[PDB]
Structure 1
Amino acid sequence: DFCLEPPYTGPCKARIIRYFYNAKAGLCQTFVYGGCRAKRNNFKSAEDCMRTCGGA
Structure 2
Amino acid sequence: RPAFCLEPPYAGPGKARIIRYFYNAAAGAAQTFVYGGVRAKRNNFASAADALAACA
TM-score, length of structure 2 as denominator length: 0.73
Structure with more of its chain in helix, by fraction? 2
1:47 to 1:14, Cα distance in 2 relative to 1, 3 A: same
What is residue 12 of structure 1 aligned with on the other side? Answer: 14
Length-normalised TM-score, structure 1: 0.73
Structure 2, unpaired ranges of 5+? none
Count of matched residue positions in the alignment of Structure 1 and Structure 2 = 54
Identity fraction in percent:
74
RMSD across aligned C-alpha pairs, in angstroms?
A: 1.7
Which residues of structure 1 form unaligned runs of 5+? Answer: none
Higher strand share: 2
